[PDB]
Design a protein around this ligand. Structure first.
Ligand SMILES: Nc1ncnc2c1ncn2[C@@H]1O[C@H](COP(=O)(O)OP(=O)(O)O)[C@@H](O)[C@H]1O
Ligand SMILES: Nc1ncnc2c1ncn2[C@@H]1O[C@H](COP(=O)(O)OP(=O)(O)O)[C@@H](O)[C@H]1O
Ligand SMILES: Nc1ncnc2c1ncn2[C@@H]1O[C@H](COP(=O)(O)OP(=O)(O)O)[C@@H](O)[C@H]1O
Ligand SMILES: [Mg+2]
Ligand SMILES: [Mg+2]
Ligand SMILES: [Mg+2]
Lengths: 528, 528, 528
């Protein structure tokens, strides 16, 4: 144990609050429109450029120990808010700073900080209840378009793109974004059962195009194991040639000898066939082959429990699809006739599975299979020209996407902070058990006015003035910063998710209130 | 041997006392309500936040050698108190500091410190005897609820939860806490014989649910060895299919070949079976499978001494239970018909075992088997939102739990330090052998007033005033700090364990009195 | 995470702008004629000497962190411009600096930088549209000659050489430059099917010259596999000797035993034969052998798909060419009679391939095969007497080549910056959505006058004067710096690619406008 150092009372309080104020002034700019980006130095390549408040937050590290403690207690709020709701980081940080500063003023010699924490918790409960009461669900895609248009920092193309994605894939589809290439954004819909793996032999190339193999109404072979012996591969090709239709071979791997047979019958007379390996790592590829068989209609081969030997295959034992396309690094199955009721039951199985089980990575490929079997997958290849532009725009896009998915399931509320200001009468409605909880109530009451204050600040206007004049106005009337005036939000097209707001408020309030009761700080000696 | 340094008399005394005063001022706040947390810097992640006095104590390390010696002699008191009674750390630290300070004033050139130690020991004996005489056992669960409500730092939910745990599991049940997930705490009762291990083949999945296998009134197979040959596994399945009932296979491990037979008969016609490995890791499994067999009623297979070959099994040789459920990571046995007198005798065996043998880890799994066979196991999944909130609340909960278990077996006393103040007349009843023992007696007499003094200090009130006015009052009347006034404690619902008080007092008195006789200190030179 | 440092507002802005001004003053000289070279210190040898703006750019690294950030944001613009269009680096850097400086003046407390970025983007769109409208395609080789003559920094020999290369190879041929060896430049045309590998045995040397093997109308043998057994090699030589014509053996490798047979029949009776291995790669060598077979006219041997054993070869199964010559390190095939329609279809295959697929190293060897089959690649040896002169002249030549290839496909425009000045009325034609976009528009409007200003500066003349007097003049009239006066450019023979201009402008505008919105900079502490 390294020799440590201790500090008491107002000293440690002032140092920690200074550190938190440093970290929070670093970030509080990036709220709403008129916020301003932040450049961080990447140690190896180009620096990062952001508006996000966790890259900003998680990047900051302070030399002094106590200020470092402040920075850590802010970054934990940021990180929890991120991992819980994805967006609402800046709000978390600013509310945390305000709550901490208010806490480090009522710390008397007669006050009991734990009661302060309790009262803060009561306030948070009351305000979150008032939020959920004043929420409202999302129904029309106009609301989705609006929310997405917001969370790109006021970009409308992002809103339209996410709207079209959620419409052509469904409100619980699987959309994902990749680093775009061209100057502009792109919304691609990977439809059908498609996956990253190309035709093994470049002799199946019947496309007269960029390395494609195109079949129509072809049969399918689905082996969990490899295909080594000629005796194994031969009867399948026999049945295919008897029917005189193209054949796909989705299996673990193709022997060079059966491959030689294939290429022999392909170069000359030309038995329409094609060879492709399995989809993925271990068990996941097994389940995916099962799903592929049940989708196309047929039966997986190479089983353990029944094992379905290839020697005895049958014309109703093959996978059948309308069209198949293969490119050197991926293939697509289109019209698998797989007993739509049966695939429905499969879907119900895997959906109850995801409902019960999840690990944030299990459920990832879970929904992967769901979307790959039911309705496409949306990719969002973005514009941009520099890597830093790419990172910026992609960050904003992903943030908007997470906000939209949070808003689709749980209700929305009037944007621009108006919800909390409307919830303040709830705080006026509480009755504290004693003085200390009332102190905490007044702390949260002051805190609720903080965010719109910060926003008006960023706009370059009078914070408290705008906050008061908003509180005087109606329930739905509030302040736009872009138009710099008062309007109805939903009329104007500004709303926000309820889940993001509630999670951010809860995280910030909890961590800051816990921080307040600190009395004595111990730190490592500054040796090295 | 590194070159060292020596110091004599008042110098070394003052340095060690300065170090101990640093370490004890660091902690003395965290007593009773109105105590205040401490933030410690974790070297790698988020800082810790505490009220406990050993994290605080064990964290502190001083640059200067002599102050380091003081810190070590305080941390040893803290650590002994923890490992002995679990709670009573802060009290140990404060009493140790007060005893040390009183000791480093009577150190004359004519005084004999060893006699001082002797007198202190006599005082401690008298006071602990007076404690145990004025103790009183715990009878009703209201006392348990009260005590738990205290030791969450005045939280009532913790009290109610621990009370319900001890009621639904018994005053010597096995309750344990894990890092909760949701916003709120949770009291879960793992009942029956349940253990962390999932069904091997995901073909036994008859639940139509999140990866469950549910059987009712199924037979059991219990092998200490693996199940490789088809000849070995076959007769069991024969008997099960003859009776036409589901079967569980609890064994070391299942061959892929017998597994293939199982999956064959399961996918088609569907002999109700299920495969699960052995719960215990090592010899613990060698006992646990025996216990499982005797619980369900049957006989373990794969024995060494009789070895019970699987080829000749019998319908009365199987484990029989009412219901069985298996997840992907654990399963539960419910209604094992295992000769309740016989399981009783087994329980008596293992309980006499724990009574005789223990290693703090042997006896752990010992009570594990006891509770798993007799009445459930209580888990206490906690609330919280941040990792630091989790650590804080879990620490307080575990402390309350340890205090409750200490109080259930050995008597309780009036809380808020009143017991020692009531025991002071015992010190007024002693007769010293000579002057020095009388000096030690007066030392302990002053010491006994220290804690309530510190508590009133934390409250923000006059220490000696409150101590005196309490001493003037009745035996059961004392001071609440939350109501900041005088009440009857047991009337008010404040009590404490006698074991915690006695152990803390004994540890602090012993180590501090030993410290007092120090005359000359030697330290490592400060090279590196 | 190392302890970091933060800076706000005007401070970080001033530091980053100082760094960018350092890096841009380092480079801005090297534009047009009268630009001046830059010497960089190579850490292990002779230093580099350049006019390029990415050796200068990528070399510069600043001690101070913030200035380093400025340098990185400039080098990224330079590198993107390079990797996109190859030339137009200096223009990118200077436009970036001007845009950055203009940005770090309108940064008020009321201004919204994101709107500034938006307006800049609108300006860039308008200007690029006006460029493409005022472009014009390249038709006559005079234009190519002029462009190349420019981009060697006004060298005419470079222009003539690149013109002759593109004429004798076609506007989409494959020209490449290598480090010359003589005093002067040299344009070599590798025609026929030639590749780096020499005759294995130096007994086939019938040239009476510097290690050559010359055959006329010889047969060809093409094995994908080695040639080990005498039985394998013997029938080919049998057929060749029956026809009584020389034979080439292009295969994986020659056995020492078949080699012994060859040398036996060579030193004695004098069979005409020659042995050469494959090109030597992986799949690329197999494709090249296939193309060689289809070029000469014949069947590749050692195939996997269709075996084509050497034992049964046929007089129409051999590769046939007009003339073959072999060195010790490369050989050339001439007049391969390979079914010109068939080779045409092959060309169409590989060209659709390149049209669809590319990886910047796949399409490289792709065009390699295209040219090697249809038009001999043009190499450019550079004549210089110092290694540093070699690097300088070669850099300028490669830049001129890249500029020419960019200009051949996409249109050209009047050189010497006149295009942007002519596009400024487009900026006068826009209507901003609000004030901020108008600010950005005026930013770009000022920016467009920057480059010609810098050029007149380098010339030693009055920048703004020349810019204004050009703007007063006609559309096609502008300023030469070499003649230091006004002329018509296309009349005078100055033009430039539209792609270079558009890409440079776009990159610089994008990255600089993104940089403008920075508000807070975070850097690593300067520890080490
Ligand atoms: N035009 C707008 N006018 C008024 N308020 C807005 C506007 N756009 C966004 N906001 C508000 O600002 C917030 C966006 O700030 P943001 O960058 O997302 O910080 P965080 O990452 O913590 O969510 C939204 O919650 C919204 O209420
Ligand atoms: N409401 C209360 N009013 C008066 N005394 C209390 C109250 N709650 C706890 N105490 C007293 O304070 C002590 C709790 O201090 P504690 O945090 O447990 O320090 P330690 O870890 O050394 O036990 C109890 O022994 C009790 O006598
Ligand atoms: N003799 C010339 N007279 C007028 N303008 C010229 C002349 N030569 C080049 N230029 C102009 O200057 C530019 C050449 O600068 P350059 O060295 O190519 O910088 P960069 O590498 O960024 O392209 C050309 O785009 C051209 O418009
Ligand atoms: Mg946000
Ligand atoms: Mg305690
Ligand atoms: Mg150039």
């Amino acid at each position: 144990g390294s020799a440590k150092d201790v500090k008491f009372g107002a000293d440690a309080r002032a140092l920690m609050l200074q550190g938190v104020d440093l970290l929070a002034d670093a970030v509080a700019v990036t709220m709403g429109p008129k916020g301003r980006t932040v450049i961080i130095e990447q140690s190896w390549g180009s620096p990062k450029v952001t508006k996000d408040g966790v890259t900003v937050a998680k990047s900051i590290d302070l030399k002094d120990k106590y200020k470092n403690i402040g920075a850590k207690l802010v970054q934990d709020v940021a990180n929890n808010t991120n991992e819980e709701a994805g967006d609402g980081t800046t709000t978390a940080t600013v509310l945390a700073r305000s709550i901490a500063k208010e806490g480090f003023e009522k710390i008397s010699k007669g006050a009991n900080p734990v009661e302060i924490r309790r009262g803060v918790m009561l306030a948070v409960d009351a305000v979150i209840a008032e939020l959920k009461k004043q929420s409202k669900p999302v129904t029309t895609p106009e609301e989705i378009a609006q929310v997405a248009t917001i969370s790109a920092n006021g970009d409308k193309e992002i809103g339209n793109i996410i709207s079209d994605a959620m419409k052509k894939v469904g409100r619980k589809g699987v959309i994902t974004v990749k680093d775009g290439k061209t100057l502009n954004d792109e919304l691609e819909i990977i439809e059908g059962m498609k996956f990253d793996r190309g035709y093994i032999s470049p002799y199946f190339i019947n496309t007269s195009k960029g390395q494609k193999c195109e079949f129509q109404d072809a049969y399918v072979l689905l082996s969990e194991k490899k295909i080594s012996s000629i005796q194994s591969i031969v009867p399948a090709l026999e049945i295919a040639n008897a029917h005189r239709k193209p054949l796909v071979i989705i299996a673990e791997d193709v022997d060079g000898e059966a491959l030689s047979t294939l290429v022999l019958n392909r170069l000359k007379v030309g038995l329409q066939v094609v060879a492709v390996k399995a989809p993925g790592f271990g068990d996941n590829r097994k389940n995916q082959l099962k799903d592929m068989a049940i989708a196309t209609g047929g039966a997986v081969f190479g089983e353990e429990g029944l094992t379905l030997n290839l020697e005895d295959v049958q014309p109703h034992d093959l996978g059948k699809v309308g069209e198949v396309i293969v490119t050197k690094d991926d293939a697509m199955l289109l019209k698998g006739k797989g007993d739509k009721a049966q695939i429905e039951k499969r879907i119900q199985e895997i959906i109850e599975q995801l409902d019960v089980t999840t690990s944030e990575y299990e459920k990832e490929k879970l929904n992967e299979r769901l979307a790959k079997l039911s309705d496409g997958v949306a990719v969002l290849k973005v514009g941009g020209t520099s890597d830093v532009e790419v990172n910026e725009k992609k960050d904003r896009v992903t943030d908007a996407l997470n906000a939209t998915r949070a808003a689709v399931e749980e209700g929305i509320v009037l944007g621009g902070g108006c919800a909390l200001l409307r919830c303040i009468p709830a705080l006026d409605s509480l009755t504290p058990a004693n003085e200390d909880q009332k102190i905490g109530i007044e702390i949260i009451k002051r805190t609720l006015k903080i965010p719109a204050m910060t926003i008006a600040k960023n706009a370059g206007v009078e914070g408290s003035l705008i906050v008061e004049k908003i509180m005087q106005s109606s329930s739905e009337v509030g302040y736009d910063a872009m138009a710099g005036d008062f309007v109805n939000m939903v009329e104007k097209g500004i709303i926000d998710p309820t889940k993001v707001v509630r999670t951010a408020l809860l995280d910030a309030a909890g961590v800051a209130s816990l921080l307040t009761t600190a009395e004595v700080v111990v730190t490592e000696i500054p040796k090295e």
